Design a protein around this nucleic acid. Structure first.
Ligand SMILES: *C(=O)c1cnc2ccccc2n1
Ligand SMILES: *C(=O)c1cnc2ccccc2n1
Ligand SMILES: [Cl-]
Ligand SMILES: [Zn+2]
Ligand SMILES: [Zn+2]
Ligand SMILES: [Zn+2]
Lengths: 8, 10
DNA sequence: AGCTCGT
DNA sequence: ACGTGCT
């Protein structure tokens, strides 16, 4: 849920 | 999920 | 109750 | 170095 590297 | 049963995700 | 990735 | 979004 976070998008800090993936943003899922 | 869904909604319902968002996504995932969002 | 109901889930998911890496830049 | 980080949790998200309604039925
Ligand atoms: C989004 O909040 C979120 C939280 N945990 C995870 C674990 C593994 C892959 C993706 C994820 N996304
Ligand atoms: C994005 O690819 C990414 C990768 N590793 C992490 C570890 C801890 C917090 C955030 C992260 N983001
Ligand atoms: Cl991981
Ligand atoms: Zn509830
Ligand atoms: Zn990882
Ligand atoms: Zn976590």
């Amino acid at each position: 849920x976070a998008x800090v590297x993936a943003x899922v | 999920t869904x909604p319902g049963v968002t996504x995932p995700g969002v």
